[PDB]
């Protein structure tokens, strides 16, 4: 019934190895440093306000806000997120390889770390689509899902299984609602997983 | 034979403490933020292609590629690596202190995270040398080694033991082969460990 | 009584030669390109408004206004002048050599070229002082004068003659009134003439 010291050490070491591999141990074909990129003309407008002012030698120089690129970068400290106006928005990503998409990951900060006391800005209902080229207006539905505010920070979602699985190198994320924030919605990180084409 | 809850908690906590100390718990005298630096005129040419284009207000502005400085920076997400042309190359580092070198670390991404499906760009056979000054053409051999593509992401290598151990503040890493990639070789992080001189 | 063709040609050629020598044929020890400079912490505040907006790729980038440096630069097209608030102001200049100052020149545009129909922004009553060092609060009076709005564009003014003529390398121009403009006064060019010290 009980475990030995050697067995406990092996369990710990295996868990830290998986943690070190981007928490999941799975390729992220959206990650910017590995070859993913944002298709900027196909994203929602950024939530525009006068919040962050950058100065040099004491005089106002320019305002700063996060761009959609941060959604395909791994830092998820509070504020390292892209914000769009309201509760409906979209983001289009070009992947580092042509793949058969199998699953998607969304991360948000946990409530225990939020400096507003809530994660009401998190996405709630969303869907993912595959696009055959950068000009296609309506892509193929790959799945519809809900990010659970009472679940874990990192949540994974399985793509629909079809008889003929088409390959894609462009994916659209569409947000339909948030967890109640009345001004904006915040996206920390979106990942795309699957099998490369031969 | 079996372990208690208190014993398991202590094993877990000790493993996370070591993980938090740059995975190894050992000083890295090559790390740039702590005082290491690349001697740029003594590195191989960078693999030069038109891959990454940076724009501002919609118009092409300049191309981006990683520099040899990333080899002495800790982020090892896919693509946060220096690439040189072919399978023979070299990098020269000035250390943060004069030391007796005892060991070296090389990291590469695991195959499970590669967006190409392979780590054929990883270094294979390599050697490390100590240089007495920045103009010396041939340094003293500190060891010859092989990075194992079927081993762990982080691998450590022990320096040769000599009767009179000379101290060094400059080290050359020379790559002799890679794991098969036909165009380039990629280096994620190189570390240098040892005992400071009094 | 009458002149010959050869005599007329000689008169014309002599007049154009003098014109080509900065109109006066006299060294200007305040001229910036020859070694004069503005002592910025000893000038009046610049007339501050939102007039000239510079853009790049369509988005507002920064506002532009002329600095006191233009007063020691030779272009005097309309607008190539320094403006200060109201009708009292001052400018301090370091000269290219230590000299005995003998005379001063002020230029303003002629009324025939003003796009407002007037030269009411021109200086009227002014004085010039010599300063022994950059921290001296009250210098020695070198002369008090009036720029005549009904005179020529370029007007020259003779310094006071004293029994012991002190040498100076720093000069203050003080404006006491203008020709009626209710918001600002504009200075196109100020020159300083004299004999260098051995």
């Amino acid at each position: 019934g009980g475990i030995t010291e050697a067995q406990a050490r092996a369990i710990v070491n295996s868990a830290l190895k998986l943690y070190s591999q981007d928490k999941t141990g799975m390729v992220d074909f959206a990650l910017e440093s590995g070859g993913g990129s944002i298709l900027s003309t196909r994203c929602s407008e950024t939530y525009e306000t006068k919040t962050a002012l950058m100065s040099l030698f004491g005089i106002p120089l320019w305002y700063f806000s996060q761009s959609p690129r941060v959604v395909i970068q791994p830092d998820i400290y509070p504020g390292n997120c892209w914000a769009f106006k309201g509760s409906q928005g979209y983001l289009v990503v070009r992947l580092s390889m042509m793949i058969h998409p199998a699953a998607f990951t969304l991360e948000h900060i946990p409530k225990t770390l939020s400096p507003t006391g809530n994660i009401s800005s998190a996405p709630k209902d969303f869907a993912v689509y595959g696009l055959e080229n950068e000009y296609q207006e309506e892509g193929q539905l790959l799945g519809q899902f809900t990010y659970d505010q009472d679940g874990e920070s990192l949540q994974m979602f399985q793509a629909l299984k079809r008889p003929d699985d088409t390959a894609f190198q462009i994916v659209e994320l569409r947000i339909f609602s948030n967890w109640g924030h009345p001004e904006y919605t915040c996206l920390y990180r979106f990942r795309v997983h699957g099998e490369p084409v031969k | 034979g079996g372990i208690t809850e208190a014993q398991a908690r202590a094993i877990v906590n000790s493993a996370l403490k070591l993980y938090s100390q740059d995975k190894t718990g050992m000083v890295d005298f090559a790390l740039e933020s702590g005082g290491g630096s690349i001697l740029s005129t003594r590195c191989s040419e960078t693999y030069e292609t038109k891959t990454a284009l940076m724009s501002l207000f919609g118009i092409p502005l300049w191309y981006f590629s990683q520099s040899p400085r990333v080899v002495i920076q800790p982020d090892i997400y896919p693509g946060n690596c220096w690439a040189f042309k072919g399978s023979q190359g070299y990098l020269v580092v000035r250390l943060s202190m004069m030391i007796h070198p005892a060991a070296f670390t090389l990291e590469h991404i695991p195959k499970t995270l590669s967006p190409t499906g392979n780590i054929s760009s990883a270094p294979k056979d390599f050697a490390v040398y100590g240089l007495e000054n920045e103009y010396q053409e041939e340094g003293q051999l500190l060891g010859q080694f092989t990075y194992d593509q079927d081993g762990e992401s982080l691998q450590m290598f022990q320096a040769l033991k000599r009767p009179d151990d000379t101290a060094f503040q400059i080290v050359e890493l020379r790559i002799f082969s890679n794991w098969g990639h036909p165009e380039y070789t990629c280096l994620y992080r190189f570390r240098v460990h040892g005992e400071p001189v009094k | 009584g009458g002149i010959t063709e050869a005599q007329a040609r000689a008169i014309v050629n002599s007049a154009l030669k003098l014109y080509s020598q900065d109109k006066t044929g006299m060294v200007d020890f305040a001229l910036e390109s020859g070694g004069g400079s503005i002592l910025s912490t000893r000038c009046s505040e610049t007339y501050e408004t939102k007039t000239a907006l510079m853009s790049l790729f369509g988005i507002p980038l920064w506002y532009f206004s002329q600095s006191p440096r233009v007063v020691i630069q030779p272009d005097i097209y309309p607008g190539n002048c320094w403006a200060f608030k109201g009708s009292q102001g001052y400018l301090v200049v370091r000269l290219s050599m230590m000299i005995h100052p003998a005379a001063f020149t002020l230029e303003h545009i002629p009324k025939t070229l003003s796009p407002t129909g007037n030269i009411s922004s021109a200086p009227k009553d002014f004085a010039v002082y010599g300063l022994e060092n950059e921290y001296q609060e009250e210098g020695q009076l070198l002369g008090q004068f009036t720029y005549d709005q009904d005179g020529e564009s370029l007007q020259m003014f003779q310094a006071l003659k004293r029994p012991d003529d002190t040498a100076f390398q720093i000069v203050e121009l003080r404006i006491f009134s203008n020709w009626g403009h209710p918001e600002y006064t504009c200075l196109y060019r100020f020159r300083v003439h004299g004999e260098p010290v051995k």
Binding site: G34, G35, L53 | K50, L53, F64 | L61
Partner: peptide
């Protein structure tokens, strides 16, 4: 005083980067 907004620097790949 107010400055402008820093446009988002944009990044695209003409071919895959080394990994």
């Amino acid at each position: 005083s107010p400055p402008p907004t820093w446009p988002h620097l944009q990044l695209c790949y003409l071919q895959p980067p080394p990994v």
